């Protein structure tokens, strides 16, 4: 399944999660963007979600099954590997002290984490050919920010498991014979 399909599906799911969270907590507006933009870009001054891919785990020996093509008299070898990938999810939001209605960036991160761990979302995403494991920690980190104003960048990582397929060719045999000696 590789990357492009996975990234598109994850983007759609994150958009749905923000669509829910907006009515849940009454944000002004939101945006979902990927980290490591290939082109020079500037960040947006709105509640934002960032994601990135860290690494992969093969998770098990490869499994091969054989399919036969009768017309060309060939076996096509199909090998499946069940890979685990870790995505890092992080959010950004600036706190205006004057407003009385308060929503935190860590609040948005917590809601996004809770959305992906629900049973209904797992049942819905099962048809999209991947599943999610547990999430074990969310951390707040403070940085100076470009306007010399302290700000928080909460983040957590998420794991999705799927299957990768490769395809190859192999010869086929149609008969057997032997010799017996004593």
């Amino acid at each position: 399944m590789f990357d492009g399909e996975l990234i598109a599906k994850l983007v759609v799911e994150l958009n749905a999660a923000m669509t829910s969270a907006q009515e849940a907590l009454q944000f002004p507006d939101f945006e979902v963007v990927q980290k490591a933009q290939p082109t020079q870009q500037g960040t947006s001054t709105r509640p934002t979600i960032f994601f990135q891919k860290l690494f992969d785990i093969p998770r098990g020996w490869p499994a091969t099954d054989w399919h036969l093509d009768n017309t060309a008299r060939k076996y096509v070898e199909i090998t499946r590997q069940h890979v685990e990938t870790t995505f890092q999810i992080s959010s950004l939001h600036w706190q205006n002290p004057e407003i009385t209605h308060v929503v935190t960036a860590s609040d948005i991160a917590n809601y996004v984490r809770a959305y992906f761990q629900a049973r209904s979302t797992i049942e819905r995403v099962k048809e999209l050919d991947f599943l999610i494991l547990r999430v074990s920690q969310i951390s707040n980190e403070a940085f100076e920010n470009d306007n010399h104003q302290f700000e928080f960048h909460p983040s957590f990582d998420m794991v999705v498991t799927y299957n990768q397929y490769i395809r190859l060719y192999e010869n086929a045999a149609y008969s057997a014979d032997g010799v017996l000696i004593g």
Partner: protein, 123 residues
């Protein structure tokens, strides 16, 4: 001589720009242990604004270029103490971090560009 200010008589040659300056009085809480401050009666001040001309960096995919300005003004302004700073805007709100020779005759300043001003003919 460290008597009559040199900046005042220098302003009669080079030429300056006009900014709106507001000072800080006190601050209160907002039942979150976060200080929120209040300023009073912004007024017009004559000052010479210079450049330092920033360059950007990265944290990760986040470029975050910080905007900076250098300002010279014959005013006894303060950037930081156990209280707040002062504000200004040539076109957008700004705040500074430095000091200068205020108690004799003049000072010079700094500035970081906060996002925008409210509007309504640059309030």
């Amino acid at each position: 001589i460290p008597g009559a200010n040199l900046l005042r008589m220098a302003f009669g040659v080079i030429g300056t720009q006009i900014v709106r300056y507001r000072k800080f009085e006190q601050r209160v809480k907002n039942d979150q242990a976060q200080y929120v401050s209040m300023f009073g009666e912004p007024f017009d001040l004559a000052a010479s604004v210079q450049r330092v001309r920033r360059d950007q960096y990265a944290q990760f995919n986040l470029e975050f270029q910080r905007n900076y300005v250098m300002i010279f003004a014959n005013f006894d302004m303060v950037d930081l103490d156990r209280n707040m700073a002062g504000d200004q805007f040539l076109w957008t709100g700004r705040v500074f971090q430095l000091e200068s020779q205020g108690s004799w005759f003049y000072q010079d300043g700094w500035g970081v560009c906060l996002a925008v001003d409210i509007g309504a003919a640059k309030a």
